[PDB]
């Protein structure tokens, strides 16, 4: 979750 | 009164900011497509078309903002977000708009070329002739130029905005008409919001000039550019940019828009 | 608002 | 393309799950 909150939408696109 | 249509060959048309961008800053697809189609059919007929477009800044905001949101931490997407630099926007929006124009005109069998001139380089002497030579050659080649003020690199008391660019350009090119395509359907005796005004067919000084309300631009600059463009040749016409057929009926001799003619005292 | 943030979609963050 | 569209239209929490 911390990852999901300090990450950039683009990052979500990359595994 | 509008009788020059039997002579007009070289035409300069300007599309403002509220004619190219609709909702959200994206392109107004139908409006731009219709205007491009009419310009293409005008070019095919034999007229020489000069285009001075605008609206790159909005496209700018759009794509740049998107990129912002794309590369921004989810939580960080709530904290204050910087405002996109005006110059930075221009550098993206001009490219986007020029590419869209190129694709439409390649679909419409017309070839266009990019021509960016900064307004502070117009005091030079060699440019005064080089611009006239290059535009003459490209018009003889049946190629529609798309002039625009270069905002990516540049440097108020004086407003030398897009209207001034179009006016002084048509002063240089020795054109015939400088059509000002805008959201409104012409001049008005005050704001168009209320119902105590009237559409003005012809612009005579000592009947409407210092008797009407004039308000990065606005009609307080539109009128000041149009008067200077008018005196020195080149009658100008202001017409609504929404209507797709407006150019045709303007050039067919019909009575559409407002005239700023140097010999308007006769009419 | 963070609660709302979590609910919204990147699409919505825009507009 | 479809994955991009799915990610563009999803809830943060959904992105988590
Ligand atoms: N007679 C008038 N007096 C004052 N304001 C006017 C008058 N007629 C129109 N306006 C307003 O001024 C604005 C001028 O827009 P315009 O300068 O043509 O395009 P842009 O500002 O988007 O480049 C219009 O949106 C219109 O609402
Ligand atoms: N590049 C844009 C062109 C748009 C524009 O100039 O319209 P105007 O300020 O004359 O109403 C700008 O300089 O603001």
Curated annotation (Swiss-Prot), chain D:
Q: Where are the transmembrane segments?
A: none
From which domain of life does this come? Eukaryota
Q: Which family does it belong to?
A: In the N-terminal section; belongs to the glutamate 5-kinase family. In the C-terminal section; belongs to the gamma-glutamyl phosphate reductase family.
Function, as annotated, reads: P5CS plays a key role in proline biosynthesis, leading to osmoregulation in plants.
**Which protein, by its recorded name, is this?**
Delta-1-pyrroline-5-carboxylate synthase B
- Full protein stretch here: 69 to 85 of 726
